[PDB]
């Protein structure tokens, strides 16, 4: 009994690795000329119904918390936003001393020091002449220096460019596809807790419609889980790691800005146009959001029940409002129609659970300028949007951070906190992993190469 060795080319075997992915966007919107962020004009068109083919008798293990696509995706967004603001105009000439005063057009009692009516000198198209123009700025964009003498809050740290009106901030689905020689797996187990072997793993050349949203807590428009609201974590015993709760039935949230804002164009220089708020038409009403009272209470019921499986059954689980700190972590900030919101969420995470119609209204605040999460220094200016802004969205998951209490006092308090922007994408890239195909295996057989 003598047998020899052979080499088999094109043999199916894979190794965990990482590489650089590329575009995959729908071609339906290509005709709609939009040179916006997350571009479609410069990309490989996607493929209809990619070759998603099932696999059998295969066992593969996944790990979100050390995944590489989430890391690479982040740099993709960071490298894109910077490129999308280069053609836009800077705001260096606007850093001027302002003469401001309160605005009272029978303003509602809800807010008093929210809108400031500022007037400042500015250079017209001709360098010699100057003009006295006025605009309305939110209270979070002006600081006092010494009376009425205000300046933009971010004119002594770093100037930043205006958001180009041509581009848009709405999320466009982006599919991810591996290059030639690679393959993207995809777990399919319903009871997949993030880590461990996935029995029914299947391969696909391109990921499903992924729409990365920019939200801190209560991430919106996510991919719903199939069943059994699932609590995904890394080290649940440790309290320093976030908990990404994803639930099946989404609760609808309606957010509106009843103020009838009007846009006004001001010529900073030759071809340099700067937009600013004009005169508010009608009464001024605070921007708020609504979530159904009945569904939300039921939704927390599922989460609490699904959470006791890790902390026992006789545990007094009670939620608490946000921790307290930076304005973008206390509230939850979400883009809506080109304007950035900041909605107080203390009305939701306020209850206690024992182991034995109406609509919730919450206030919100708006900031024209925002300290970009992409980098510490450079900010961004959001031009006002005419009319009334209203947008509905799907709240699909939560980002709960546990409280590091003592071992005794079994009342375990959970608080919400966004913090890392990566987690918003990790909640949608929890199914895919990238692998490297390695053909040219070796096996034994019987031959004799004739001479």
């Amino acid at each position, epitope marked *: 009994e003598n047998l020899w060795v052979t080499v088999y080319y094109g043999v199916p075997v894979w190794k965990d690795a990482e590489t650089t992915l590329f575009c995959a966007s729908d071609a339906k919107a290509y005709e709609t000329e939009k040179h916006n962020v997350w571009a479609t004009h410069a990309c490989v068109p996607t493929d209809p119904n990619p070759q998603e083919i099932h696999l059998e008798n295969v066992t593969e293990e996944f790990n979100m918390w050390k995944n590489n696509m989430v890391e690479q995706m982040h740099t993709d967004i960071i490298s894109l936003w910077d490129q999308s603001l280069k053609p836009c105009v800077k705001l260096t000439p606007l850093c001027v001393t302002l003469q401001c005063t309160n605005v009272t057009n029978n303003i509602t009692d809800d807010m008093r020091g929210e809108l400031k009516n500022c007037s400042f000198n500015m250079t017209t198209e001709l360098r010699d002449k100057k003009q006295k123009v006025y605009s309305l700025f939110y209270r979070l964009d002006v600081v006092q220096i010494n009376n009425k003498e205000y300046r933009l809050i971010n004119c002594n*740290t770093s100037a930043c460019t205006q958001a180009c009106p041509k581009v848009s901030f709405e999320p466009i689905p982006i599919h991810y596809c591996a290059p030639a020689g690679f393959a993207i797996l995809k777990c399919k187990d319903k009871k997949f807790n993030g880590t461990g072997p996935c029995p029914s793993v299947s391969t696909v050349q391109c990921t499903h419609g992924i729409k990365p949203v920019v939200s*801190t807590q209560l991430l919106l428009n996510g991919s719903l889980a199939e069943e059994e609201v699932m609590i995904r974590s890394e080290n649940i015993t440790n*309290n*320093a790691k*976030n908990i990404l709760v994803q639930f099946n039935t989404p609760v609808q949230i309606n957010c509106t800005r009843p103020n009838n804002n009007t846009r006004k164009s001001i010529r900073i220089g030759p071809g340099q146009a700067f937009y600013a708020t004009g005169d508010i038409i009608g009464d001024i009403r605070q921007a708020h959001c609504n979530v159904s009272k009945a569904t939300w209470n039921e939704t927390l019921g599922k989460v609490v029940k699904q959470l006791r499986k890790h902390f026992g059954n006789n545990t007094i689980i009670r939620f608490a409002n946000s*921790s*307290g*700190g*930076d304005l*973008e*972590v206390t509230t939850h900030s979400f883009n809506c129609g080109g304007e950035f919101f900041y909605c107080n969420t203390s009305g939701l995470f306020n209850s206690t659970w024992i182991s034995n119609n109406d609509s919730i209204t919450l206030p919100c605040r708006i900031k024209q300028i925002i*300290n970009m*999460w992409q*980098r*510490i*220094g450079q*900010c961004m200016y959001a031009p006002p949007i005419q009319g009334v802004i209203r947008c509905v969205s799907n709240i699909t998951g939560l980002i709960l*951070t*546990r*409280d*590091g209490g003592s071992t005794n006092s079994t009342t375990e308090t959970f*608080r919400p*906190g*966004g*913090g*890392d*922007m*990566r987690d918003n994408w990790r909640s949608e890239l929890y199914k895919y992993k990238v692998v490297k195909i390695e053909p040219l295996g070796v096996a034994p057989t019987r031959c004799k190469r004739r001479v």
Partner: nanobody
Amino acid sequence: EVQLVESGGGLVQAGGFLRLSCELRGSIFNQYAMAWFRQAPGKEREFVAGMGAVPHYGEFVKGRFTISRDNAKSTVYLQMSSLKPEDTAIYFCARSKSTYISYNSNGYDYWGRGTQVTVS
């Protein structure tokens, strides 16, 4: 690898002056916000100061301190001043998960060794 180093600190006469520092070497400096926590004996950790894109201070700071981050050296300083005897504690340095600061200790994932400061 992500690691941090601290400054001297040391004993300082009551109502004196002191400066602390913390250098972030591993990760990028313009992608995270650093903050300082103090742990007095027989007490839990609490927030003192932290700089993301806008400075923040604790309840007991009362504007005495001053925090600023130098992008060139990738370090964060702390212009401690008017140290009352009650301020003695071990002052840690921590890096937040992202560019925002949370007063809860669970918002940071890379702590420092700890600088000992005493006031007499």
